[PDB]
Amino acid sequence: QTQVLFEHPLNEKMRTWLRIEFLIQQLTVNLPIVDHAGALHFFRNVSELLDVFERGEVRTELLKELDRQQRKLQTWIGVPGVDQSRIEALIQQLKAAGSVLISAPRIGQFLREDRLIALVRQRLSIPGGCCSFDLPTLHIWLHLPQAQRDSQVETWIASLNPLTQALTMVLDLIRQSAPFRKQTSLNGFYQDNGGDADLLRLNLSLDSQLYPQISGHKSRFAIRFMPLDTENGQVPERLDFELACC
Amino acid sequence: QTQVLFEHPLNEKMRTWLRIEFLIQQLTVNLPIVDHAGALHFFRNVSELLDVFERGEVRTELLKELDRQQRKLQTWIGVPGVDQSRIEALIQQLKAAGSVLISAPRIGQFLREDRLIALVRQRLSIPGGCCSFDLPTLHIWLHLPQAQRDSQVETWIASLNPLTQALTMVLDLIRQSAPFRKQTSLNGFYQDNGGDADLLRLNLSLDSQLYPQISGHKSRFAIRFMPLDTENGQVPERLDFELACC
């Protein structure tokens, strides 16, 4: 049968962390950059990556979250009587993940400074503005050799290993913190108390012409399952879904 | 010779048609819409494309150009041995694209009225807002069956078939009405009058480490040839390039 995951942030920093995790993956979509399309896709996701670091301070809270997962993993270390080896190198994976970020360059500086990127990013604010005759540097850049762009791209993506990785760990260690408890929604409606929880990972069943519309006040969240167009396939119903509170 | 074709729009109206022709090309380029990237690339294009239409009325500008080129071809028909039926037959395509257009659903509406798009479009201005948790409605659309979207993609394309049929011809007739003269540039500089010309097609050479920086004063235009890399690789000398006033 058909299945779909629905991640949703329960707080203001997971929102940011997921936004970025999405932005960083997009850099790597295919990566034979060849066409106008190719380059723009990249720089928009980079510029958008940059726009976040205009605010936020993504370095400090990742650090603090890594110490959290350590203090978590700490809890499990002594007893129970299963897994010691894996978890220790898993902690040492965080210690090195944590360590490397703070001493690394002011995150995003390389691409912020970059000349080719500098140009395209100011022209990403006009509709159809970033084009051939508008970005004469871009237009030639594409005409250069096939593996010249690939030498500038890798360095472009590689500059954010301090951020990419640190995050990549933290988020794996979140997504495993909560098992999938099988719920049921009355009247196409549901509430609970998230608690400390950062994320919801809502698994949706038979594709009911429905999707999770989540709201929340303080710690408590309210899921309401909306259908695709109001009077198109209206079946609010009693749903039998699966939801984990990471 | 690894010739680097630089097209430059000398008037405000050509500047517009290039923006349009380029944005449409960026729809049909990728095509299957498998990924999230593949989505956002398509939806963002449309977004921007819709923002251009709300300016200047391209319907009532393009038609004036479809009316122009018709009369231009009509000059050649008088004589001599060169062409007769083949141009007469072409004129029927320009009458066709011209009327097909003059009687078409107000350009944009099918993509503004369609709900999924205008939703996505009001969120684009936010960096990384086009995210599963801020627009879950796109997640499902991207989880829908492999066949579903294609029919929905091909509609949104055909919505814009009247314009694409009209434009592509007007630009391709314009990129034919003139040939490539060979010209020279001292101290990386050039000046010349455009006159009746809508465009500058300009073939530089095998990446001479140079892009042209065209400016304008009325119908007069000037090229300041700039090199790659700032205070490093300045190589303007006397340069030998070729141009086309189209």
Read out DSSP for A158-181?
Answer: HTTHHHHHHHHHHHHHHHTSS--E
Q: Which residues of A touch B201 (CB under 8 A)?
A: none
Cβ-defined contact of B36 to A26 (cutoff 8 Å): yes
Q: Is residue B137 located within the same domain as residue B47?
A: yes
| B49 interfaces chain A, CB cutoff of 8 Å | yes
Of B51, B127, B132, the CB nearest to A52: B127
User: Which tokens is A106 given?
Assistant: 């002011």
Whether residue A213 contacts residue B139, with contact meaning beta carbons closer than 8 Å, is answered with no
Among A140, A161, A178, give the residue marking a domain's end. Answer: A178
CA A204 to chain centre: 20
Q: Which of B222, B150, B133, B238 is closest to B188 using CA atoms? A: B238
Whether residue B168 contacts residue B176, with contact meaning beta carbons closer than 8 Å, is answered with no
Q: Is residue A156 located within the same domain as residue A191?
A: no
Whether residue B93 contacts residue B170, with contact meaning beta carbons closer than 8 Å, is answered with no
Q: Which residues of B touch A131 (CB under 8 A)?
A: 18-19, 22
Q: Is residue A240 located within the same domain as residue A146?
A: no
Q: Is residue B53 located within the same domain as residue B161?
A: yes
**The CATH number of the domain where A190 resides is what?**
2.60.440.10
- A77 to chain B, minimum CA–CA distance in Å? 34
**The CATH number of the domain where A121 resides is what?**
1.10.3900.10
Angle between helices B58-76 and B161-174 (to 10 degrees): 40
Distances, alpha carbon A124 to alpha carbons A114, A119, B132, B145, in Å: 15, 9, 23, 33
Q: Is residue B201 located within the same domain as residue B83?
A: no
Q: Is residue A98 located within the same domain as residue A154?
A: yes
Q: Is residue A73 located within the same domain as residue A123?
A: yes
Distances, alpha carbon A234 to alpha carbons A85, A208, B115, B138, in Å: 52, 9, 17, 19
Cβ-defined contact of B211 to A137 (cutoff 8 Å): yes
- Structure determined by: X-ray
Cβ-defined contact of B8 to A35 (cutoff 8 Å): no
Q: Which of the residues B131, B152, B202 would you substitute to probe the A interface, choosing the one with the greatest number of A C-beta atoms within 10 Å? A: B131
Assess whether the previous peptide bond of B80 is cis (omega < 30° from 0): yes
User: Which tokens is A96 given?
Assistant: 């090195």
Q: How far apart are CA A170 and CA A176, in angstroms?
A: 10
DSSP structure class, residue A101: H
Whether residue A57 contacts residue A203, with contact meaning beta carbons closer than 8 Å, is answered with no
Q: How many CB atoms lie within 10 A of CB B196?
A: 8
| B119 interfaces chain A, CB cutoff of 8 Å | no
Distances, alpha carbon B219 to alpha carbons A133, B45, B72, B113, B190, in Å: 17, 31, 20, 40, 15
Q: Is residue A33 located within the same domain as residue A7?
A: no
Amino acid identity of residue B153, one-letter, is V
Q: Is residue A166 located within the same domain as residue A79?
A: yes
Q: How far apart are CA A37 and CA A114, in angstroms?
A: 20
| A23 interfaces chain B, CB cutoff of 8 Å | yes
Whether residue A146 contacts residue A204, with contact meaning beta carbons closer than 8 Å, is answered with no
Among B178, B208, B235, give the residue marking a domain's end. Answer: B178
| A41 interfaces chain B, CB cutoff of 8 Å | yes
Q: Is residue A20 located within the same domain as residue A71?
A: yes
| A129 interfaces chain B, CB cutoff of 8 Å | yes
A120 Cβ contact partners less than 8 Å away, ≥ 6 residues apart: A39, A40, A43, A47, A130, A135, A138
Cβ-defined contact of B22 to A132 (cutoff 8 Å): yes
Q: How many domains does chain A have?
A: 2
Q: Which pairs count as long-range contacts for A163-167, CB under 8 Å and 24+ apart, including other chains?
A: A163/A20, A163/A24, A163/A58, A163/A59, A163/A62, A163/A101, A163/A107, A164/A24, A165/A97, A165/A100, A166/A62, A166/A63, A166/A66, A166/A97, A166/A98, A166/A100, A166/A101, A167/A17, A167/A20, A167/A21, A167/A24, A167/A62
User: Which tokens is B182 given?
Assistant: 């060979």
- Three-state secondary structure readout of chain B: CCCCEEEEECCHHHHHHHHHHHHHHHHHCCCCCCCHHHHHHHHHHHHHHHHHHCCCCHHHHHHHHHHHHHHHHHHHCCCCCCCCHHHHHHHHHHHHHHHHHHCCCCCCHHHHHCHHHHHHHHHCCCCCCCCCCCCHHHHHHCCCCCCHHHHHHHHHHHHCHHHHHHHHHHHHHHCCCCCCEEEEEECCEEEEECCCCCEEEEECCCCCCEEEEEEEECCEEEEEEEECCCCCCCCCCEEEEEEEEC
| B132 interfaces chain A, CB cutoff of 8 Å | yes
Residue of A nearest to B28 (CA): A37
Range of the domain at B149: 12-178
Cβ-defined contact of B207 to A18 (cutoff 8 Å): no
Q: Is residue A82 located within the same domain as residue A92?
A: yes
Read out DSSP for A194-226?
Answer: -TT--EEEEEE-S--SEEEEEEEETTEEEEEEE
Q: How far apart are CA A8 and CA A222, in angstroms?
A: 12
Q: Is residue B1 located within the same domain as residue B78?
A: no
Among B178, B206, B225, give the residue marking a domain's end. Answer: B178
